[model samples]
Target: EWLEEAQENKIYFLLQVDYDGKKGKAVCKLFDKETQKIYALYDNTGHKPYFLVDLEPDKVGKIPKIVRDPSFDHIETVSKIDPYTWNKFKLTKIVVRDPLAVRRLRNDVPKAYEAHIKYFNNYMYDIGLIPGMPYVVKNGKLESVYLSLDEKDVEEIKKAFADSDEMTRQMAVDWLPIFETEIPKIKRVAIDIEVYTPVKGRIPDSQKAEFPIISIALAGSDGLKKVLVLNRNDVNEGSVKLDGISVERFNTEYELLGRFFDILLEYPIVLTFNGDDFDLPYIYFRALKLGYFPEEIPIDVAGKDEAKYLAGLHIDLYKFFFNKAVRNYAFEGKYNEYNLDAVAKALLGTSKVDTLISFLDVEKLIEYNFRDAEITLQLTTFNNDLTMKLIVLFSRISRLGIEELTRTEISTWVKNLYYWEHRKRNWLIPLKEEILAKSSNAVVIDPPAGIFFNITVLDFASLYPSIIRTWNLSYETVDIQQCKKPYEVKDETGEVLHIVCMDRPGITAVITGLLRDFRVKIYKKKAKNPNNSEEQKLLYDVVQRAMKVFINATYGVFGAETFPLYAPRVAESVTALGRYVITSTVKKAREEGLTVLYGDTDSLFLLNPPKNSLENIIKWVKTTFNLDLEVDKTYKFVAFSNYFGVYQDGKVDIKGMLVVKKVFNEVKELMISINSPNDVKEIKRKIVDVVKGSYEKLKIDAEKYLEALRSTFEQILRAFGVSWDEI
Candidate 1:
């Protein structure tokens, strides 16, 4: 029946995939924008779960346990190119009856490759299906569906990078359609459940299912504002009204839960804050205790602490926001804490209604519940659904499901991203040990710690990614046993660090380069152009931002041992090249009659450099290294003493400052006002006044300093022309 409906060329985005225990196959949950519903598409293709073993195909048959195992389907010889050696070898592929069957076999095996990969991930790789990418099930066969891209835009991008290397230009051409695809507005409902507590301030045990669910709030994208309340004798109605709220009072807990279940089934995507640990599990257990059958309940206990819906996908915003990648990279660390109220306050500028829950006030409790749900919904909806779009983009790029993408860190995303790329090129996924077995081996010049006037800060745009692209650095290309080394990277001591293969482009390098070029060249321009509409700008901004996250992590992943493609030599080469690039650029700057104030990694602070001289240095760097060196900013004056600078726009950037106290903000105010070196004297006088006022206020109010200080009173006050004894 699903096949009959799906047969008519309908486009669907792959949402998630799960193992169907009863069917003994993988079930993919797909979202159709037209219907706004999730369609469960079971695997019709006869692809068995499989893993590779480090043993000969004939030798596998001789092992009696492996041959006699009930879960074992068959063994076949598969030829794969070794990532470390770049040599082809035939390895045994053990096909299994189900996803879990390989785990038991792998546990008994001494050595294995591609064993730890998730079953669904293996299946997706085998079928060449990218998650978050559109596909169509036509004529009972699934096929990739490419969205219609703007040819004019496409041609412009191609023409822009026409002079670039073949690989980078082709990558821009390839990535356009995927990035430009219209992000569907996902229909979802946010749920917030309140459990009855006998003791104040103590939360009810969700696992025990003993407490009655007092209230459940439902806030949906389709303007559904509902509250299901369990009417208890002790709780009063309290003649208060909630605007636009449809409240249904139920006599029994079962009826309220049943209503909630129906609402849950209505939306394809359910959102909750900390629901994985609390709300969802509580509802599942409580509903079961109420004599509801397993089939009757919509929630599924997927794991120990995780819950999923049978007919819909559950997204725990708590887990998503808790992800360091999403928090720091995506949201830019707007929220310090992961709790609903704090996050809501930071991002939405509206917070949860501050109130103490009392059964005496049913209206207040209901509003509180509603607000939590509303905040959860707004978190996803803010900035034109930027969070949701980011999730989808991450899913698309990472090739992981929303649930998986949300829960994991940036490294997992990068791992799967490169793994998918490896799979695409018919390259064997390298084990950690294989890459680790490969041998290991930046020049950051010490900064001159002093104040300088009219400093111009120049930095290379995406330096590491650019280096990776330019040098063609990758696990396979670096220290290859077969290829002749055409390019050599040398350290400051003039010792050769490592050599790179010029015969072929590296897979990792090409991927990183392509992303960097598209982001730096195309998407960035499109995002900033004033002529672009708000919608276009938003889309372009997201594209570039997503690219920024992925590109920034590309080099770091190679350094991280946990990453599947971890290559120390490749990582080392990137730094070596970075040091070389910066060092050479510094030397060129000096040759062009520019005084280099300081050089830090990829950035250089030039002291009062002439415009023509700066242009000459930039031109030289471009011509020499084929890397872009743009002036990030120009400062009126820079004090390298503890690294504080006043930019041309009167913006003060201070780093490694000992004073982070609230009182220091007064000093910060004076710092921003300084337009020239002479202005510092006036600012210094104001700083003395600020310190005196702060001291008086402290004495009068009997208030103590809130923050700890590294610098002593004498050390801090001496700069302000104020003696510590005078205060």
Candidate 2:
């Protein structure tokens, strides 16, 4: 909010903070206007904090009554009260050298500064904590009261520990600057490039990519599209003309690379679908081959030729999507980010699909190369900027810089969220241990295939989170020997699962509950407002969706072996109860004459359900489990292999079903553009023929049938004047 609206709109997003770090070294994009200023500095070598677990729990009391260590501060034991021993364990703070910090005891020319990163991790584990990552600051309080620093300032920060308990007094002196102002959203350009090289089946080696980057395309939400083509002595054509698509010609690859850098400077955020893997690197190497010095350009290069920049942010969307799915626990429904082509097709409803472009002459398919950029930036012309909104919302929630948020892993994000709140309460974070408590697995019914109609889906909303709150689930509460209906629930072994105090509140119940509360009240409220601007609605939708992620992740981290807050009992109980709830609903549905097809950890698939079936199931779960259940969806009809359902009408409701997952490129193509009875009849005829074959024949023909669908699907769209890439 500190940034002026007019200024914010005219340039890259701006944030105002009492700036720190190396003076005058901060680099930012220069706007055409003269209203340049500083909010924060680029201090790559800033202080980082780490977590420490106490090796000696009993010595915590002996941790001097007048403890005033220069390294660690605001130490509080996160270990819960142990009524048995009438004592407690402790999780606390420790001071260690920055993992990347250069030392007199370190290596230099032989290895990269980044090489010792794992070196630092090994040191962290040897010293204490299982993991130690770069730490970010929370507004009102410091997660680690001791901010690792060198010299007189470090002494000054330690002065807070000279007195009584540091929690309340730590804030008396502003050891660090507080930044709560909102940063404006950044302008991003999603791009893709095409090149002609000696290699046909694969991309050419960048080092000697003798072939020029024949075509370069740039597009973004700003509604700008430019396709720059290189005029090479080895090529036959000079220019390209396409309807509604403007193409520009460049004299050389150098000219194209140079202009690419110039445009990058003009834009604050440059996005590419899989630029990290191919496009960006190819450009870097190509520029070098052409004697163009990118090291002197706005794009910054580190150990690798990654576009690490200051004034600008290079968002390799595939990089983020990859981590979000593979690493961050991002829930990918039907959208397979297996490749950029798949991502665009799923998210944008189209893609500039690669089809032996290498064999085609550049002059003949200049439009195809140009369309790659246009298609990638369907971010400009889509239902909502879902991806961008998520990044912004995540940055806001985790307090990470926008650039960092794009690639941060999920476990790290969850840790950041917990630590941010942990700082406020001055609570110590738990540490990983070889010892893991026991818990139970979820209950599920693997039903056989059945034919049916009026299929409906009933799911528990935030099932785990709701159960955690309703049953007061948390490590601090469970595992205790206690009362209230005498803690009842028979496990699969017929041994009843009991809790210490079912009526008593627990840490997770309160914290995760507040998360759901904020989501429902604020994010969900704004999301449901139809009058909100499309962009605003997009904003709320992502925020609400992100809240769900956080809520679910809160449940997920407990399952992680290294999570400081790991509680096997707590994690197990959540899954066990989720299983119980869904399984119970399945039972009730069957009793009501609704044929239940399958069920998962928290959802049920039903067929031929009466009009009142969904409502009755909801009531049944609420009354019996004392936890709320809601209708997840009502599919026109859902087909499945076993547990996961098939992707239907573009919306994915379940995971891999026995319907058997396969890459059916053509059928999916037809699925995207089918709007006629003839189309349906054609599909029906093919399916009937496949079904009428022998078992082996059925398997072979099904794939053949799918391939055929993709073969003809493109022509149908062409008849409607539709391109392969349409949002």
Candidate 3:
């Protein structure tokens, strides 16, 4: 009866065979709303006929029990819904509740409730609807037609709602300041291993040998979990022992791998010291040889295609924490060690087990190997939290997700938006043309001497997005008209053009446009209704950040093979466009009698020009090219002395007021410590005391202590480390 009802409702049944090595098939039902009749089996594996066992909705619980216990297999029952009521019931009348709110309530009561109250109040205020208005609905209307609440009742409701709204708003506002710093706390499993090689000097694949993974170590929430051994001669076969913080012996590699795989499935996220190049690929390859399907592994990570594999989310912590550029700027030389042991020791003040033990010996190596995993686990956990916080902060600021990205991912996302737009408009968006124009006109300018001017820098918050928006650089905008001659093109701008290879909009342009539109919607929603659910906020932040990364990375992806728009022309165009903007900005500044000091791809720094003149120049750049430009940085007091000797030869140095303060402070401290006994010493002491007294009194009211320390010590340390070996 249940099967018949399902068939009448167009529900299909699906089954997969041999999943989890069960002899019976795994089954699920699929329903098509449009057909309103049961169609075919969802699984296409077989056409063999099979009888369906009917069960009532309430009795559906018995099916699982019967399946589990053979004693109940003989029982059978017919199932049916009240057919009359089913037909009369319209889902449209079902009150729509927020799933996000429900999920949040189940997870976090106070936070979710606060969000909901805020959301309700904001909605009411925006629609100009009075609270406590009696919801009177006409027969066919979905919304309330008449509000029956009296003025007093309305005022009472408004007061209650307003009170709740105020409380939530105040709390949220207080929390909002720190929200940027908060990150999801996640438990992670870190893994490392030492595998057996087939032969000396022979690659594992060359010998056609099944290079069995030798030893494995894992550290997780449970602490130093295991060190499993595969080929221990003295150990009885298939035996395993856990001896206080270390693994004494393991009988077989297969058993060890099975347990490891099981534990891996339990973790939501996985971290490895260098998993991408080492652990992940090795494990994946070896697991296949062990008759494990990639999907069956039960980890949630990207696949061999670098796109879709899932066991647990795998993060190569080492790559991110030691990113060269991030290290150079954020950490300076403080944590320069890249080796897992070295980095852990330097940053976290922890080290792996000593390296003197024989690694080839299974028992000894297991201890060492496992300790490596333990240390790695600790360090990665620390870094993961730090990275997550930064990612969250960045996402909140940029409205992007907490998925910290690599340069490649950033570029791909940007290109995706462009392509999405292109497809929507059905035209070829030429990235190459725009970038080429920019790059060809790139320029660098020096600051004019004897100028006392105040420079202010202004920049487009997101320059690439602005450029794309301003230029209407969508594939649809790039109209292509057919011509009598092959390779000839005519654009909608009434310009005859060349390169008529495809009529459709480029894929890159379409993707970029879609991403841009998505971000715009997110931005508007966030602006209009600030009380967005946490998940929505999280997702919004992710999408926004993805957009920024995509925009910034767009040019580089053009040359990458994985990108659809893999053309040298696109990269060249982007670079050229950047060059053009910088050159144009500098030229404009110089024309205004403002000396340009330095400039990067999209920013110009100028010597002190009149504050008004600087502001005017910034306005002109924006108006002329329709791009944002402004002062990037300024010095309170800048000094250019013959300080070349203070730095490497041929390198000119510029010191600011902040640096001068530190120099004075150090000299004053040295003078205070000097002692004198003889006549010459007395004279030296007097001079030192006078200098110290004057400097100390002068530096007392300093406002830039942090800035001074950062400029002097931080700058010196950075330059010193980079040039140390050469010096």
Candidate 4:
């Protein structure tokens, strides 16, 4: 086998590889970023994906028991060294060269080599991934984010993406042309299609799924735009012109779809709104009804009707707005709705045509179709193509296909980062839920609720991550029974956990520390950039977002269930230390005679503390916790209340308690406004004021009650038997 021929050398560096969403064949589609060209060794042949293992033969004649496991095709004794560890463990590589054999490895077996390989997508699996590339940090600098790539002179590495399981390489130095100081312009086309149903008042059924695409609008970055109106019965010569935008008439659905393919070839990228869910699927179904192959239209439906483009990117603005984790952080809950119209209103301050453009007559409907495409174009292309710049920038750092990255988790970006980290040093990553490592309990502190004034809020939001960054608390640093000095940890709730503590920390520590610095440096560098152009602003934003993805994921990956190196101890320790700092601060505040209103895990409220007290608190926290703490927020006055036990800050802050009470706002004093003030006189006045009656009716009732009381007393006195108290 050619694999056997190649296995003669134990070491190899794979330049590029990719695995689509599935375990498919090269084990994936391979590509060059700068060249925009794809390459393959044996993707179409009988050859399959396999694993190259560096087998460690124990002292004596015993090998790694390579053949004992039936999961692999067969084992070959190839000479190898653990590159990450300085030839520390020399071993024979138990090469499982059969693709089937490699895929057969059970998910249950958590080992070093398994960490190196993608067990699911084996065809694109190569020598570089299993042994991985080196990711060493020298003098506080991580070597490079692009260390996973076998390419060394990495320059101008652009044009990377995924077409389903087939993906491209995932960033680096300013010296590389890939890092453009100025954003470059790329050509893209915006498109939208309208579907029509024969019957009225019923939406088109994707189940039975047959509907004519009435109009397909192809709008461009320039003023250039066209809408292909089908069913030529409405227009003469199948053409119309309005306001410099043209509408062409297509006699058949097939004719319109064919013209769409031709137009797609004319642009490098395509933009759409809700095209993934509705437009593309609708077009595909409409095409199939006309005997056209979906691929012939240059759009591939990979999964869930997700449209993948050939030789270009299909940027679904709908997916970009409603879906990604970046959207959550970028907008920070400002734009919750992902609809094209809603997002346009939020971001661009413009109203969009109604979704039911189908209601319009033929002439108006054509214009509406064109209008939708133009709005999408205007949304992305505004401010020097800001939206696509973000998409491409995100794609570069994460190394996911642009379309897929728009929907992936931030943790996935972190996992890919760790993959190269693990591979470069020939280190194997730990599997999630496989390690039975001892874990400290989670920290949960409920603050005492009350109204407070002049409160200083101290935040420890970055506490746990900082611990991991500085202390190197991770699986990489940890080793047991035959490895390092042992320490048994116990939580406050009487739970004891045994672990190995004092060892040279692993790449996990080095990676996080390096990334943390990388983030800060960019923050500093970005601050130096003057606010001149919106492009620069966007470029700055993308840079920060790019760095933040790595920075944020470092701690998150440690706790992620899907992450290969999910270390509960590290995650637990971070929270545990976080609790220690917060509680200690609360206790320290009380000791200093400062009023501690409420204290939670990472933050606390100090009510009317001394003016010079922040320094003491800061000094105490820094000295004791060894973590930086700062005031994150300040308020003129913070109103608090306990209604049926749960504290409500104000009716304005949350929706649940908004309408719970209407007579709730006579806040002459803070206490009465929030918690009911315990003043009985004021309470009686409030109660009396709420009695349901007019002044005249109330006087008559009072007179009647007084007369009845006097009459009863007089009758008792007058009656001989009923005088006063008794006989």
Candidate 5:
């Protein structure tokens, strides 16, 4: 039964149904006063209605349901309404001034102004309603209508809307809203390129000797796709369309650059494999040679140096992926080859096509060139959609945006903050003044000294960002500050000077804050709540990993021209200060009457019987700088051995010793296993007998095995024209 009710001249109906695990249905209908078209609500589920459905006076209820579908294990009463409710409630003009309505409307509205228009139109059709001009809503006697919005109205409407839609709108809105949200979340792109050069060892240069781009391939939204060959002949023509792709060729490099600019302007993000050193600079230089204005090109490649052309909104995936510390620890020696082809083959299991051809051969060059673009596109797309997404998710949890930094940034920032806080407390600056004055007096202590001691390293995750937060290191802060000799850093504009500190509240401080915050969160999660959502846990892990990479790489960047903070003196000063801290630590240990065996930049090797001595050191360091210092690790046993003549004439023989040890003693049984032994007793007895045998017998057997292995290896090396010593 469908019971109808009239409220404020609008018709509403309630549907009721009953069934014993059998087919049952309900329906309601409504008549549009303007169009005179009848709309129907067909409820297939035989359940009590949660909301009233408006319907015409007389219409057949055609709701359909499967009586005994095993897929639906248990039946529960759920109110069913027409999906057309979305269309009926299509909002044309949103009143942003009313906070209440805006909040409620935002729950289902598209964030982008343009997207919302399409969303509104699509919503009308989804419920079988035609989107016509002069949109209207009618009660019984009166009707409310809306007109198309003007440009001015759209601007005002956007001002009050939230950047993202609420989760409740997922069902009503098209997936476009979600896609829009997800797209901006992308922070990284893995890029690769395949190219052909005239000479076998020809380095990529700007001498116009290198072949022009023939075909270009990009692996993006739909995977690897390529454009046909482009050349002088093609450029002379207005347009050359090939293989379902169209190309508007230009006669001069300027014309070509214009087209490139047009494309770049269209996309907010642009990624290319080795774009910094190769693709980008090449294009820019070529365009300049052809009389194209440099200002017309829009991209901020970070630093002042012209050699590095990766600036605003540009990320060189190669630099990040091939980070020395990260490569050594995370990837091990797995992707030893840092080239795009090698890395991509290892990571994505795909190789660039036509990589062996010479560009002088126009046909082969085009194929190779296009293949590179295609591969790069694929890699970047994969990274942007998958890897970058994962990384951003991690960033949110870690509260660290991805940035290039060096190790010294963290230490410097923490020190700066410690002094700043001291100044605020009216404490004398003599302590910091004394340290800076004595900085140059420090000495570098390498290889450490004395007996082997347990080592633990505590590091800030994203030290620079942390420093920025704690010290309020922003453009505004710097601009407002009153300093006689204001330190300033310039951007690409060169009109305005941005202040950046080599030592104090600046980039270094910002990164330190991020690292400290991330570390705190990690500890809290590990100790208080280990079990969280899988996504949250994955995010935490990625952030933790990324933090380690950033902290280690921070200092090297300061000396690199690619970084805006490229100052050799500043980098040297930080290192010098680190030396002072280590020396002080050693002196402090001696004062405590504990033997200070060895010391490094940030570590003190101590030999003591006190159980809490390591903890005390950590506390002391933290108190000294108001920074977090943790006891990272402890070793139960230690050993030091030297291999004399391991290398001849300063060249090392790669081959050495094979040391096999169980990673964990608790899994000894699981660790020792052989594939499908005929008799378990026999296998166990054989292993036991081997263990019980004398060292003389084992030594004899080991000698025989080593001789055989060495012979095989020597043969293999000889095939490559390498001698035993040469290896």
Candidate 6:
């Protein structure tokens, strides 16, 4: 029964992995979307935890930690290749009886390789299993599976990218089906807990587990809306009714907590707002304080700020929303705050009911707690489950488990991407110190400060990733030592900066290049096609957004010091190439009798460019640099040398329009009304009047308004060549 046979090629999504401390091996968890149940698979191959060090197998006997530690299993010689020089070398692979034992020998070795990777992730990488992607079991072994895409679409994508090399096209084709597959509707439950407060204004210490959990609310995808509340004589069950919610009352708090956990065990995934830091931990500790044994409870507390379910995956929305990448890139700064109420209000356009600490009405309190869980689940369900889709898509790209992917930042995702790539190719992952020995700033055209008309903004499509592809820049290719007849990147002054190898395509270049091509060529069109259904459009849109997040972080990670494959020179080369591409285009524009108003890092702002002027420049850019240059946006009129511009569509774009929020709103209203150069003059007059009125208000009460009326407005006045006292 434990080793049941697969029923006619059924597929499962690899969800997460765990290190079984007792069994001393990795355990894999798979989710069957059709059944909506989680299945566990043990490591039957007996893969042990191991790390490599720059020592012979014979030399390891001299190390005290390696020889003395009981957890140290054995040492074996492994052949590895150097990423920099492509030289083959031998290293001692120190196999450990347990995952934690690897850490004991990390400091003991003078130099180590593959030591920092988590054991569970290592097992997945070694076994070639990608989390969040589909797989099929055969003969008690998991085999990878891919969804089929439209043949017409695939061929069209292929024809579009005919200019790309073999590997780039191959990588792009492999990724398309993954992106095309429909996201399975995840059956999950969102939970929120409300603890009792000893004082009127403050929350009790959750770590102490002294206070009673007054209420626990759960909102599930299966239309299960229930609230477990401790029945108290002091709390009145008023006539305030909750629609579609079942309120279950318990005489003892212990039974209420137990009921909550019992309900929790039915779901494969548990969603919580701040469960990692508070809700889940509080529940676990409070339950333990109430005489529940460790084996009786399903929660596993991992340190202070993390907790997980024993059998299910716990995704903390707080951690996902708090991540800088998800907040800025994925959500595009949709929600500025990490709190559940603020995030829910921003994304879902709904908020929790504001109330005091008065639990006098038990029904009202239940409604409040229920709303929190409702919106927490809605956060994942909104926009066609975009949050959940992004997590799965990112996991597919990063090759990380859902639990690890939700908690980590963008750089880690990018790092794991290349790490998995290295593992697949049997290439050694370069240490941070190795790649550190190996990585410019980008060009800007300053505006004349004043007003202009009919400006067009033209930029390269995914410039950084394009440069990484066209120049074949990577940690391996950007080395000066490997170049023969090197491709020399130069500065604006024509100074030779760095050389790139014209050999094989780099791994980073191919990966990022394929993603860039996929996003720009295929998905971008599919997402914008009106002929497609709303579902297809939304799915493609989410796919492109995921690709954009990954592509945007490619070049930056090479220069990040904490990155395992950190290469400062390669990052400098990317910027250096960026400067070369933009500067060269600027020269071509001037030679074509076109006036360049301004040039940013990757874009050019032209003042009323002629018909053939833009066409010629764009064509020249393509032929010269092999990059796509298209008009990003157009402006009706630009002011203060392009710092401020009103778009042709009556929208305004202000560069760093930092001012006091109150006064900024006053000028912003007038600024939005400016359509042309003539409109700017009138808006300027209105803005002056607004500023004078603000000054008069501030002069009357200087002390009351000093903070908001400070020197923030000084820079705005100075930009217009006006003094602070001129008003």
lDDT of 5 by residue, 99-123 (tens): 2222333333223121221121122
Query: What's the CA error at residue 368 for candidate 1, in Å?
Result: 2.1
Model 2 lDDT tens row, 12-49? 23221112122412222222213332223232333333
Decreasing TM-score order of the candidates: 6, 1, 4, 2, 3, 5
Candidate 1 achieves a global lDDT of 0.78
Q: Whose lDDT is higher: candidate 2's or candidate 4's?
A: 4
lDDT of 6: 0.78
Candidate 1 collision pairs: 443-579
User: Relative to the true structure, how large is the alpha-carbon lDDT of every model?
Assistant: 0.78, 0.51, 0.42, 0.52, 0.37, 0.78
Q: Would you estimate the TM-scores of all the predictions?
A: 0.90, 0.64, 0.46, 0.68, 0.38, 0.92
Worst 10 residues of 3 by lDDT: 86-95
Q: Report how far off residue 380 is in candidate 3 (Å).
A: 7.0
Query: What ranges in model 1 sit over 4 Å off?
Result: 1-8, 84-88, 160-173, 234-241, 352-360, 440-451, 530-535, 648-650, 658-664, 667-676, 679-727
Please, what are the lDDT tens digits per residue for candidate 4 over residues 429-546? 4445445442322445443433344556677646656666555566644434344455444445545443435444445555565445444544335435684355556666655655
Best by lDDT: 6
Cα error, residue 647 of model 4, in Å, equals 19
lDDT of 2 at 403: 50
Poorest lDDT segment (10 consecutive residues) of candidate 2: 126-135
By TM-score, the better pick of 2 and 4 is 4
> Whole-model lDDT, candidate 2?
0.51
TM-score result, candidate 5:
0.38
Ten consecutive residues with minimal summed lDDT in candidate 4? 159-168
